[PDB]
User: Which sequence fits this backbone?
């Protein structure tokens, strides 16, 4: 989508967790990060 | 937590959605953004 690199609040271990999340969902950090926040929206929507 | 301002991928409308999400969950963007990504982790955990 129109996903741009914006400033977000993430903890170092949390950042790693996102990588792990990426690995858990078989997605690359770039894709995972995008979906982590957007899919977050998708989950609550 | 140890949430620091890191680079994340967010769309302009998505960014606004986070504000809306903040408003929907009665949290401030700073708090919402932190929880949006961390709570995202909480939801999938």
Assistant:
């Amino acid at each position: 989508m129109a996903t741009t690199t914006l400033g977000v609040k993430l903890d170092d271990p949390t950042r790693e967790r996102l990588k792990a999340a990426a690995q858990s969902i078989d997605r690359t950090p770039h894709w995972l990060i995008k979906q982590a926040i957007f899919n977050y929206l998708e989950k609550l929507e």
Notes: Chain A touches chain B at residues 1-15, 17-18, 21, 30, 33-34, 36-41, 43-44 (CB under 8 Å). The helical segments of chain A are 12-24, 29-44. Chain A has one domain: 11-45. The longest strand of chain A covers residues 3-11.
